[PDB]
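#struct-pred
JK: can someone run the complex with adenosine-5'-triphosphate? inputs below
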Amino acid sequence: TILKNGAIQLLKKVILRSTVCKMDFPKDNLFVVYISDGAQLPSQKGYASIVKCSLRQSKKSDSDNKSVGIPSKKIGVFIKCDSQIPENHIALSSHLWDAFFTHPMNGAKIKLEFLQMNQANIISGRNATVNIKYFGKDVPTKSGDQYSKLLGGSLLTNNLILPTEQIIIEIKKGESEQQLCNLNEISNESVQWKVTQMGKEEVKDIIERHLPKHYHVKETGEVSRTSKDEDDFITVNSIKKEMVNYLTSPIIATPAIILDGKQGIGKTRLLKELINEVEKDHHIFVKYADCETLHETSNLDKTQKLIMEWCSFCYWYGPSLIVLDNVEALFGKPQANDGDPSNNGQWDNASKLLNFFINQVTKIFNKDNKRIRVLFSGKQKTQINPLLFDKHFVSETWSLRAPDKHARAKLL
Amino acid sequence: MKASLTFSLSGIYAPCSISRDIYLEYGDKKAECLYGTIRLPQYGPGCTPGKIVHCVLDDSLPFCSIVVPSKLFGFMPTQPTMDFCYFEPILDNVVPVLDSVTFLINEQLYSKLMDLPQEMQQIQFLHYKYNINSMETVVHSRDILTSGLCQILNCSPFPQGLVDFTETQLILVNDTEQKLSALKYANEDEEYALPKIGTNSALSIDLESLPCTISRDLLRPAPHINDDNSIYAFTDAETLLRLDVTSGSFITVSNMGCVRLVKLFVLLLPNGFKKRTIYAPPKIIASFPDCSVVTISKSNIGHTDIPIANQVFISRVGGWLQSQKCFQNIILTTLKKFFSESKRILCQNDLIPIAFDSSMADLNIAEENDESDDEDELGQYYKNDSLVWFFVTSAELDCFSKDNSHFIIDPNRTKLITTNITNRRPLPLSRSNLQRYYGFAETFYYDLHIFPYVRQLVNILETSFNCSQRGITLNASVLLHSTTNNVGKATMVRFASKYLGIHLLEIDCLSLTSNSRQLDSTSKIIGYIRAKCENVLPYASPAVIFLAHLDSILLDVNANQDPEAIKLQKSINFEMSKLLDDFTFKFPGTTFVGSVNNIDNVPSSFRSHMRFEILVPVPSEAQRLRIFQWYLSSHELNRDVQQKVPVSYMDNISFSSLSSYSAGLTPLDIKSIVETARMTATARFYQESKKCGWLPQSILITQEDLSKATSKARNEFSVSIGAPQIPNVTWDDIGGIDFVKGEILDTIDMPLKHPELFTSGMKKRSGILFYGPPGTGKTLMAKAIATNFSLNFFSVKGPELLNMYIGESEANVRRVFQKAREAKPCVIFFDQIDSVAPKRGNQGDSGGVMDRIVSQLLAELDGMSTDADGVFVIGATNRPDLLDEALLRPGRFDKLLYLGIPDTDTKQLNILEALTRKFVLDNDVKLIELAKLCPFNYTGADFYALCSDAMLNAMSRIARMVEKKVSQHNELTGENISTRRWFDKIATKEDTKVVVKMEDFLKAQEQLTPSVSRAELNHYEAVRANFEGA
Ligand SMILES: Nc1ncnc2c1ncn2[C@@H]1O[C@H](COP(=O)(O)OP(=O)(O)OP(=O)(O)O)[C@@H](O)[C@H]1O
Ligand SMILES: Nc1ncnc2c1ncn2[C@@H]1O[C@H](COP(=O)(O)OP(=O)(O)OP(=O)(O)O)[C@@H](O)[C@H]1O
Ligand SMILES: Nc1ncnc2c1ncn2[C@@H]1O[C@H](COP(=O)(O)OP(=O)(O)OP(=O)(O)O)[C@@H](O)[C@H]1O
Ligand SMILES: [Mg+2]
Ligand SMILES: [Mg+2]
Ligand SMILES: [Mg+2]
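RT: done, structure tokens with the ligand placed:
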């Protein structure tokens, strides 16, 4: 397979699952990815793209304006080997997630194409310019030359975009290959630039794409992210140290774990740092929701739609860990006293929801042990709906306890 | 490593000869003999269990190619063999050593083994006789040396390993039953009967559904055509004396008016298949009826299969899988997934299978407006979950006049058709086994005998399949119920459906509705089930409609029956019943198949119409054997996992043990047990792998693990549904009670564990009460005797039967027998029974609630469970005379447990002998003199108080020591340090832990408090004179 230019030949195709490993070399290269030493590499240069994901469009016009999905716009990258990642996963560079126009997150699948560039595309001989169009308002432009350093200088490709401060890297000119281009070895004498000025009539056509703006809330953008409100935690009780091992075994007795303890003993912060550690160590995806917010709990159908949404989302991503805060408000037995249990019918409104959830998840879990797990939080093991225990949905368990004076002081 | 593989006639201890190149990757001076990892890929979905062999270099083999001895695979090379292995070299060449070695030999040779008069003489002769090498021999259980010789029975701590010829168990076993004569290495004794070479056709060979799908790689021929062979059938070399033509790659069958042409190929020795049958892919068996086909014919006309079909015709087969918009989108795109790379090869009216992943419903499968080359890569990431049949509607064509006998679709041709639905019978499980090919969550294969009610239900349905020839519409229906949840009703019906070859429709009433019974909503409930029924049933199949958990919809309200509540439900149940009748009138058969939990509250106005009322039990001990067999079956554990290590049980387990230790458990508990075991096994595996050393390349399961899990499960049951504070004490600690505890314990032992004397209709000592003074422990002995036979346990903690609501407070009484009946081998204990037992002749005042609860309770515990034998009830109260009348036969307790004061000096010593054991006893003076010193007026609580005082005083003495040492150390410092900063952080056992001496007992022996005055004992014995002196 030789492409539209005889300079380029196509070698092999694979699909791989995106993960985070926090290895990058921004002072050297950006538009690059790293692949396991077990995934023996046919070529260090290639093309990649997100495998687009969105809901079925199960309703006419999807109830919203956008008519058709934007194409993949696949980007060429360098590929470099490392042992530090598990098989078939990919480390995707920080300045590449933003090009793929979604927050950096272990999750969606990547396309990977392996490529040959022939001697027809070696150093020099096409001293091409590139437009650096400003896609949003900025200081009166800095020099184009500095971008040859600050983009690392490793690689480029036509029609590149960088939303971090909204610049477009694009060229469409004769006497250039208009493809993947080398840059790492190339002298700055062999390249030119246009720091092309602002213009609404140009940018508004690009803004017709899917643009769920990533930093729409004011935080000084990616330039400074003036929005931190979090920290580490004081490692008081080792509960983290047990659970993070357990919940990441190759296989588990049942899909569910329950976490309980006295009000204010610190469920929430602990869950946040369990999330963060799981999100950093072993490539598990998370989706997280609060019983306060999904106020559909007055109705069945839309709530059912939410549960099927979470199920589907999980099953399309990699291994994932669903976590729920104060589950009693969603699935708890609605009267703590049994009372008259609706003339002993016992099926009050709530339990239906939980039954549908357990049925769906069980159907998933019988397929493959990793595909989903769930982590409840509540006040007391025995106060949540016994039907949760009846079906043997949960087994292993932990409780937090009043921290012992020694660690308590070390916390203080 | 995907090493190339070759086989040799060489024997079970001939070496492997390894490839001359790969020796550079493995051969090194560290090992005197090489040992390598043998994993020949067998037919199967799972990987290969690990084997290990003695190895040598081969000087001659082609690159990356290996010779193996055939004998370890249970065959000689009489037929062609697989040409690759997943071989691996072993780091440091290390091998485990067996503790157990065993060998089964026929009686005649065994006589020679006995004629060898000593173990060392036996070893010396026989190892040389068998050409074995000392230490250098490595073997497996289920190695068979030769026919009639050396079946390897059991090995430990591994199933395979090295033998220490100096110190291993080399166990003689005599094959007194000649079982070895049943063993064979596949070798034929003679040429097979009547070869038919040169005949155009052959007969008397069957067809047989595959146990699983087989890869593109496992067939030796693999011609490069992108789509040519999907039907991919195969047969062993027997075909070569049936088909004379060179094992030709495609052959044809016709019977019953059909046409089939089938791609047919060889089969290899590494196999479990039987002779003389075509092993049949699903698409083959679906095209034939359930009637057998036993015929084959040679033809070359494949070139006449028309390479252009200018149009394409098809239809979906009807089924519940087709009715829903929330599936139609995936089904419609599955059309594309099908016809892409499904170049047709076959006659019209064919049944092509296709399958999909039901999770995918809400997902963009990322092909529309993506194109390029991704779709089969996602198809490599997915795996399917449910399967639908497509019917090959006859094409109407103009490229050729021949249209019916066979045609080829090519996706370069743009047509399809969607003629709504066609109706066709679904295949019977006994022939098809269809589930196991596509690997879905298999239904449990019931047998037709051992769960007799299943035979009842499946016959009840079969009535209406069979009566279809008699033309009568039988209108058969059934209504399943159980006294407890989790009995698998739905799965059992599913089984029946697949076994009989009959469609099934399923809807779950916990799911079906946007709301429960409510105002202005009966239409919103009932129309939904009406619509979803109408969408399929009158179109296609035998009529089978399954409704789960109907009690959600069909309910009856006795009280709180206000109009705005009652009128809706009361309309609802009829408004359904009329629809049920309408379905039974309009459609053929209309087999309603209901299910419910608590049967009592099904609407009688509905249930009267129903008929068979099958009650499905909790599984007996004889049943659950089959349950465990299923879940421990290799199929059920070597799936949902994906790491290459396989899992198995091993021969130390025996289902009998679990059958002894498992009862009162549902199938869900059994599954949870087995998976808890699998979790423990994998955890043990990886944790050991963290240490360098010998461990198996497979994960193994133990009886002690299973037992521990069973205890865990029974605890989880007791915590969720049973009582808190389960039976949890050593009977060893209830000292001093004598033949009184003898008669008690025997009275509760014998009906529990010698049932042949007790499996009878007469009364059998169902209840006991206790009336000793306080301070002799009744409450302890109750939980202890419960622990002695693992009785189910419920404690009435006194007055909690009472409640505010006159007219409902008695409900806790019915509850007691509800929970007892739910926990058949149970002990029910009313502690402080006086709290609900005044004088039965109470008062001439009002008949207040205190009388109405107790008399009703006594009457019901006299009048019920007296027939439903099994329960036991216990009561204790330290004051006899208030339980005056219920000591007569109508109160039935009738048992004289004056569990009172001790009577003998040794027995009172036996108290402290049973009690003190948990701390360190002094014996520098002997115990008996304490009993001699005691006035004969004390009880176990008193002897407890004495030992407690003594040991606490000794703790105060060691405290008064170490506090002095701390004070001295403080004076040796700033006298101001934190009390933690020395003796505690040093954790000095010597200065802190248990010490005692008998002089602290003798000093504590005076200061007790005998609050049971002798006047009290005298009064109680005076009552005993008429309660018990008889
Ligand atoms: N172990 C800990 N490590 C770090 N911070 C902690 C820890 N325990 C408590 N905190 C701090 O105290 C706060 C109180 O806990 P948190 O807000 O998470 O409670 P919560 O689980 O939401 O409580 P509840 O749901 O009972 O109201 C945390 O937000 C965090 O700032
Ligand atoms: N007798 C059995 N043999 C084998 N597996 C069983 C058996 N009973 C239950 N199981 C397993 O446990 C599961 C029980 O779930 P199922 O949907 O069958 O229950 P159900 O009949 O709806 O129960 P319930 O109405 O009491 O909640 C089955 O799907 C199956 O995997
Ligand atoms: N083997 C034994 N023989 C006699 N007494 C014992 C024995 N083991 C323990 N005891 C004592 O029996 C005492 C229990 O006394 P008793 O049965 O009167 O109390 P209880 O269980 O509170 O009573 P109730 O049945 O009224 O609820 C315990 O405090 C313990 O010291
Ligand atoms: Mg909280
Ligand atoms: Mg059920
Ligand atoms: Mg008591």
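RT: quick notes.
The two ends of chain A are 66 Å apart (CA to CA).
The first strand of chain A starts at residue 8 and ends at 19.
JK: thanks, will look after standup
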